[PDB]
C-alpha cells in the first residue's frame, strides 16, 4: 500500500479549495542535515511537504496559485539536472519530467527561485507560509517580499497578509483517508511482526541493543528502511526511562525489558510498545504490575469510539491504576480521594493516547487537556504504563519495573481498528511464544 | 578494543603542551540534530569534542587552560542533575560525578555558561576556537569576549588573539596511536564480517535494501550500532553513481552489485566496498573490468608504505587502468599519450584514497595534489574504481558497469597492514564463497 | 501648530475601526542609532509610531487591540523610571504617567514585552505587524509567535494572520488633517524664511557649509532643531549634482548656487529649492535656463488641483522645457518627436513632485507612473530642473549650470495652496532682493 | 591646520610594523545609517578607519598586507565610478585616482571585495581584524576565511590566526602628533570661540535650544560642520541631567545654564563646558557652588603633568568638594571621615577626565579606576561639577543647581597646555563679559 500521484494532486487541491482567491501558498522541502564533518544523516523529507508531492529531494519548493475562484496552478522548484552532480550524488527529478511525475503544471530550478519567486508573488493579496519553519525558508519569502515592496517604481506589489497553513494542512492530516488507514495498517503489521521477532530472540546475556538490531532488520525486510523514531530498550531500571535510548545494557535473567519500536512505512509512522521477560517468565511481582497496565490498555481499546475523547478515556485508565495500586500496596487509603489527588502521577506520568501519522507524535488540535471530541478518520496511540523507580517507597518488590504496552488504533464509525494487535501482549500469550522459541 | 580516559587525558595534555601561555582552548559538543517535527536522529557527538572526552552529551564545553608554562587545568560545562528531565530522557552525568568520570579538573553547569565563560577567559591572552565550526558555539564565545571588552571599568580585559584550533587538533588525529589503531582494526573486521554477509545473502530478485539490511545487523551484532556514512548498494548501472544511497531496486541475475558500507565503532570508521556478481557469477566482461580495478587495488596494497604518497601511487593505478582499458578497446591510442591526457578519468574520476579515522573522510593536511609524504601511524583507504556508463562510446557488453574495491590500511614501519583483507576480493574467491552459500 | 493628545488618539482610533475584530497591531519605536563609538546620532522616532503618539522616547511599543467589534484598548511598553537613568540621560514618562499624557489605556515597562506581549496575542486571530521594518522588532514579534505556536499544552494560541498594516497606515498619512496641514505651512513659512536669509547673506567667496550654517540657525531660532534631510547647496557644477551635500566649495562670483533645505517642524518636513546668482546678477546664459524652470514651476502650481495627477501635470513640464531648450540650441529637432524620444532627460532626470508629511519623501501609493489622481488633503513639493553637465555637448555658455526651484503645496477643493511662496523666485525679485543686502 | 596624506601614510607604515610577518589588517569604513524612511544621517567615518586614510566615503575597505619583514603594501576597496550614482549623489573617489589621492598601492572595487580578499588573504598566518565591530565586515571576512578553509583541493589556505588590531591602533590615537595636537587646539579655540558667543546671546526667556543654535552656527563658520556629541543646555533643574540633550526649556530669570558643547573639526573633537547666570549675575547660592567647582579645576589645571595620574588628581578634587560643601551645610562631619566614606558621591557622580580626540570619549586604556600614569601626547578633559538634585536634603538655596566647568588640555613635557581658556569660567569674568554684552 503507499500514497499516489493522484491522491498528492487530491491534497493540493483541497488546500487550494480552503485559500482565498488571489493567494500563493509557499510548501519548503526540507534541508539537509550534517551528521559529522561532510557526512550527512539519511534525508528525511519535511512531513508537511511529503504530504503534498511524494517527492524526496532537497531544494524544492512547492507553489499553488489561486488566481481567482476558478483559476489555479502550481509551480515547483527542484534542482536541475546536472550530469557531474548526479554521477556523484544520485539521480534528480530535474524540470522537464517533473510536471509529468508529480502531476504540478510548471517546473523551474531552484537556482532561480530569487529570481522568480517575488514574479509569482506580485499583486497578490495573501500569501500562505509557515513563517519560522525554516530559516532557509524565511530568507527566501523575506526577500521576495522585500523586492515587491521596494518595487513600487517597477509596479511591483507584495501581498499584505501573510497567513500561517500549518493550522489548516495539521488539521487535513489529522483526518486519514483510506489509502493512509491502509498505509498505516501496513506499518502496524511490520512493526508488530518486528516486537514478535523481538520476543523470539531475547535471551539473558543479549544487549539491550540487540534487540534494536532484530527489530530494524525486520523493518528494512518489509520495505520500512528506516524507523519513525529512536527505539527504546530499557530492561530493568532503563524501563523507567521513558525514552531510553542507550540501548547499552546487558539484560538479566529476571528483568523485563521494554521496547518501544515503530517503522517509517511510505512515511507514515507505526508505534508499539511491549515490555516482557527477559527470561520467558513473568515473576510474581512483575505480573501483578503488568495486568494492571493490560487492564488499562484492554478497557482503553473497548471504549475508544467515535464521540469520546483521550481526557474521557484516561480518567477510565486512572480509576483502574489507583485501584491496582491500591490492591498492591503501592498506595494506599481511598480510591476516590487517591484520583482527586492524582496519586498516580508519581508512576504514570505521561499522557494516554497522541496521534499517529506522517509523524510519530502527529500534527491536529487535541483540545484542552485532550478533550477533543473522537471521529472517524483520527488514528492514534494508546500507551498506558507504569513505572515503579528503584528508590521508590513502596513495598520492594515493586521497585525497578518499568512496564509499558502501546497499540496502535483507527477511529472508525463503529468504534476503533487495532493495527498492532497481531503481536501478543496477555502475559501467558507472551510467555507461551518465549517458551517455544527458548526450545528451539 | 576501546579508547580509555586515560588517554582522552593524555590527549588533552598534548593539546596544552602546544598552547601559548595564558590562553584557553575551546571545544564545543554538537548540537542535536532535528530529523521531523519533535523527533531528533541519534545524536553524534562532534568528532574533536569526542576526541578530548569520549564524552556523548549535547549540551557540553571542555575548556582547556594554560594559565602558564607549568600550571593548566580543565573545566567542563555540562547539563545539570534534573529528576523530570532524566525520567524522560535518559541519565545525565552532571557536575558531582563528571571529574571522576572523565578526568577533569572542575564541572560547571551548562546553563551557566553565559555567566562564568567570560570569567575564565578574563586577562587571557589567547582563545583557541573553532570560528565558525557552530553557531550556537559561536555566540557564546563572542558574547564573552564583548562582555571582556566592554567591561574595562570592572576591570575586564579580553584576549586580543584568537587561534583555529582545528589545524593542530587535526594534525594530532592523523597520526593514530596503537589503541586508535586498534579501534580501527576491529572496525575493520566487523564492517569485513557484514560484507561477507551480504555476499553470502544476495540473490537475484532481492531488493538492495536488503543488502544494507543483512549489513547493519551485522554491524550491530558486534557493537557497532550505526554506520559511519549512509550504505551504498548500486547494482546494475547504480553502481556507477558513486553515493548511491537510494538503495531501491530490485537486483537483476546478470548485474553486478557495489557495497561501500562501513561500521562506526566507539566513534571509528571503518569503509568497505566489494563488487560482485548477483548471481554468483561474474560474465566475461564483468571480469574483464574487474581484473583491472583488482590489479589497481593489490599493486596499491604492494607500494602503499612510509615515504610514497597518495599521489605517486595513484600514478600507478593509471597506468594499469590505461593499459587495461586499452587491451579491452574502451580507450585507444598510445598509452603514455592517454596518461598524458586524463584519458582514465571518464571511467576513475574520483580519489584513490582519504584518510580514516573519526570521519570516514577523515581530517589532515594532504598537500597539493595529495602529495604528502607518508608516515607510520597514518590511516587511509585505497579505492580502485571503473564506471562505465550506460550511453558511453565504448564496446556495448562494458556499459553500464561499475566497479570498485575498498580496503582500508594503516601505514607501518615496515610498509602497511591491511586492515579489511578479511572479506575476499579476488574474482574466483567470491564465486566460492557465492556457489558455497547459493547450495545451502 | 502642533498635533495634540487628541489626534494622536483619533489617529489610534482610525486604525482600530480598519481592523478585523480579535486582532492587535503592533507599532515599535526606532532604535538608538550610533553615530561613532558610544555617541549616538540625535534620536528620530519612527514616522509611523511618531502618527500614532506623539512619543519620542527609545524602547517603546504601542499595541491596540481590538477584541471586538465594540471593545478595544491600548497598552503602551515604554521605559521603566529608574534614578540613575535620569540622572544622566534624561527623564523618562514611565508607566503611571504615561496613560494620562498619551491617553492609552495602560503602560508596562519594556523590560517586560516579552514576558507580556505573547500573553496580550494569545487566543488573537490577525496581527498587524510591519514585518521587516525593524530587526529588533522582528525578534520580539517571532518570539511571541513561537512562545503561543508551542504552547497548546498550556493552552496558548497564536494568530495565524500576519497583516502589513504599512499600506493601510501610508494611506492615513496621505490625506492630511487641517491640523496637519496647519503644521506644514508652519514649516512652510520657517524654511522660506531660511532660504530667504541664505539669499541676503550670500557673497563670493564664502564657502557653500556657511549657507547651510546661515539655514540651521533660521530653523532653530523658529524650534525646528533639525532639518529634514542633509541640506543640499550646490555652487557652480556642484548644482548639477541632485544630492550634492559635501557643500565644501568657496562659491564664485559667476556662479550659481542651488539650495534645497528643509526643516523639520513638529515632525513634519518642509522642503524648498532656491537658486541664485553668487554675486546677486544672472549672466545671460543663467537667466536663460531660469527663465524655462521658473515657468515650468509656474504652470505647474496653476495646474495641480483635485482630479489631476503628477504623470499629467509632469507631461506639460516637459513641453516646456523641450520647447526652451530648442529655442536655446541645447536640443535640436522637432518638438514632438523630441518630446516622444524622452530627449529632456539628459536635462531633466528627476520626478516633478513626491509626497510630502512625516517623511520628505512621504509615504503613500503613487499609482504606475504617478498616475494617480489627486485629491484635496494631499501634500506634495513640485520641483523642475535643469542641469547642464560641464561636459555637455550643447553650446558652451550653459555648461555647468544646474537649476531648481521647488515648492510645497497642498491640493484643495479649489486648486492648491503654495506654502512656500514667501521666498522670492522670480529672477528680477531675487536680483532686487539680493542688491538691498549687498548693499548693507 | 590638518592631517596630510603624508601623516596618514605614516600611521599605516606604523601599524605594519607592529604586525607580524605573513599578516593582513583589514580596516572598514563605517556603514550609512538611516535617519528616517530612506533618509539618511549625515556620514560619519569610522573613527579607526579615518585615523588611517583621510577618506570619507562608505563602502570601503583598507588592507595592509606585510609580507615579510621587509615587503609590504596597501590596497584599498572602495566604490566604483558611476555616472549615474554620482548625478544622484556626489562624486567618487574611484579606483584610477586612489593610490595617489590617498597614498595606497593598489585600489579595487569594493562590489568584488568577495571575490578578492580571499585571494589577498591565502597562505597568510596572520590577519587583523576588529571582529565584532561590524556585522557587514564580519560577514566578509568570515566568509572569506570559510572559502579558504574549505579550499586545500584549490591549494588555498587560511590563516589560522585572527589578533584585534584594535588595542593597538588605539594606543597610537592616545599619544598626538604635533599635526594632531594643532587640530586639537584648532577644535578648543573654535569650540570656546562659540561658548563665549553663547554667554553674549544668553538672556532670559531664550528656550535652552536658542543656544545650541548659536553654538551650531560658530562651529560652522569657523568649518566645523558637525558637533562632536549632541550639544547639552541646561538650564536650572535641566543642569543637574548630566547628558541633557532635550534643550526644550525657557530659560528663566534666576536660573543657571549649563553649556556643554564641543565641535568636530577635521575629525577631533573639542568638549568644553560652562555654567553661568541666565539673567548674567551669580546669585549667593550659585556663586557659593560656582567657587567649589572652579576650584577644583583650577588646581586640577595646575596639577595634571607628566607622572600624575587622573586617578591622584581625582582624589585632591575630592578633598576640595567635601571641604568645600561642609562649610556650606551640605555635607555635615568630618572632612576625612566624609571622604572615607565619598560623601561627594550624590553631589558628584561622575569622573574628572576623558581621553580626547577622533572620538569625545576617546580610546585607550585607563588602567584600574583611571590610575595610568600620565605621559606627553596624552589629551583629556578636565571637568569637575557639582549636582544638586531639587529634592536634596540640603539647605533649601542649594536646591536645583548644576554646575559643570570643563576645559580640554595637552599633556606635556613641562605640565599641561589648555587648549580651552580662551572662554572665560572665574565668575567675576563671566559677569563683566554678560554685563558687557546686556548694554549693547
Ligand atoms: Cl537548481
Ligand atoms: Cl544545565
Ligand atoms: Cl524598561
Ligand atoms: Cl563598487
Ligand atoms: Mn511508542
Ligand atoms: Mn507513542
Ligand atoms: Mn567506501
Ligand atoms: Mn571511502
Ligand atoms: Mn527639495
Ligand atoms: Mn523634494
Ligand atoms: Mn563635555
Ligand atoms: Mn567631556
Same mark, same amino acid.
Given at each position: ?73 502550481? !509551480?515547483?522548484?527542484? =534542482? ?5 552532480? +548526479? %554521477?556523484?550524488?544520485? #539521480? @534528480?527529478? &530535474?524540470?522537464?519530467? $517533473? ?69 489548516? !494542512?495539521?488539521?487535513? =492530516? ?5 489509502? +493512509? %488507514?491502509?498505509?498505516? #495498517? @501496513?506499518? &502496524?503489521?511490520?512493526? $508488530? ?248
Amino acid at each position: 500500500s503507499e500514497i499516489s500521484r493522484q491522491e498528492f494532486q487530491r491534497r493540493r487541491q483541497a488546500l487550494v479549495e480552503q485559500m482565498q482567491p488571489g493567494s500563493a501558498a509557499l510548501i519548503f522541502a526540507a534541508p539537509e542535515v550534517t551528521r559529522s564533518a561532510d557526512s550527512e544523516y539519511p534525508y528525511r523529507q519535511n512531513s508537511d511537504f511529503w504530504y503534498f508531492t511524494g517527492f524526496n529531494e532537497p531544494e524544492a519548493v512547492l507553489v499553488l496559485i489561486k488566481s481567482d475562484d476558478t483559476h489555479n496552478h502550481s !509551480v515547483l522548484f527542484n =534542482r536541475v539536472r546536472d550530469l557531474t552532480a +548526479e %554521477i556523484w550524488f544520485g #539521480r @534528480r527529478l &530535474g524540470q522537464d519530467a $517533473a510536471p509529468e511525475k508529480l502531476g504540478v503544471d510548471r517546473a523551474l530550478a531552484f537556482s532561480e527561485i530569487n529570481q522568480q519567486l517575488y514574479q509569482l508573488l506580485n499583486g497578490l493579496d495573501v500569501v500562505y507560509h509557515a513563517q519560522g519553519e525554516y530559516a532557509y525558508a524565511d530568507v527566501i519569502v523575506n526577500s521576495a517580499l522585500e523586492k515587491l515592496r521596494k518595487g513600487s517604481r517597477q509596479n511591483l506589489t507584495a501581498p499584505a497578509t501573510m497567513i500561517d497553513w500549518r493550522p489548516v !494542512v495539521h488539521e487535513m =492530516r489529522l483526518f486519514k483517508s483510506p489509502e +493512509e %488507514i491502509a498505509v498505516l #495498517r @501496513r506499518a &502496524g503489521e511490520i512493526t $508488530a511482526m518486528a516486537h514478535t521477532r523481538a520476543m523470539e530472540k531475547c535471551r539473558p546475556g543479549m544487549f539491550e541493543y540487540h534487540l534494536e538490531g532484530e527489530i530494524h532488520h525486520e523493518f528494512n525486510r518489509h520495505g520500512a528502511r528506516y524507523p519513525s523514531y529512536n527505539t527504546i530498550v530499557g530492561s530493568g531500571e532503563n524501563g523507567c526511562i521513558l525514552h531510553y535510548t542507550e540501548n547499552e545494557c546487558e539484560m538479566r535473567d529476571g528483568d523485563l525489558v521494554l521496547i518501544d519500536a515503530g517503522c517509517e512505512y511510505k512515511g507514515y509512522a507505526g508505534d508499539i510498545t511491549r515490555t516482557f521477560p527477559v527470561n520467558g517468565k513473568f515473576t510474581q511481582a512483575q505480573r501483578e504490575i503488568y495486568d494492571i497496565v493490560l487492564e488499562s490498555l484492554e478497557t482503553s481499546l473497548r471504549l475508544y469510539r467515535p464521540g469520546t475523547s483521550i481526557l474521557e478515556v484516561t480518567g477510565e485508565v486512572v480509576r483502574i491504576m489507583v485501584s491496582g495500586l491500591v490492591k498492591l500496596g503501592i498506595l494506599k487509603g481511598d480510591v476516590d480521594e487517591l484520583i482527586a489527588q492524582n496519586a498516580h502521577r508519581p508512576f504514570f506520568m505521561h499522557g494516554l493516547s497522541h496521534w499517529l501519522g506522517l509523524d510519530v507524535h502527529d500534527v491536529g488540535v487535541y483540545g484542552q487537556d485532550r478533550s477533543r471530541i473522537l471521529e472517524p478518520g483520527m488514528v492514534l496511540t494508546v500507551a498506558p504504563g507504569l513505572y515503579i523507580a528503584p528508590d521508590a517507597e513502596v513495598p520492594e518488590q515493586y521497585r525497578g519495573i518499568g512496564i509499558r504496552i502501546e497499540d496502535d488504533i483507527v477511529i472508525t464509525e463503529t468504534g476503533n481498528e487495532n493495527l498492532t494487535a497481531s503481536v501478543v501482549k496477555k502475559p501467558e500469550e507472551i510467555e507461551a511464544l518465549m517458551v517455544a522459541a527458548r526450545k528451539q
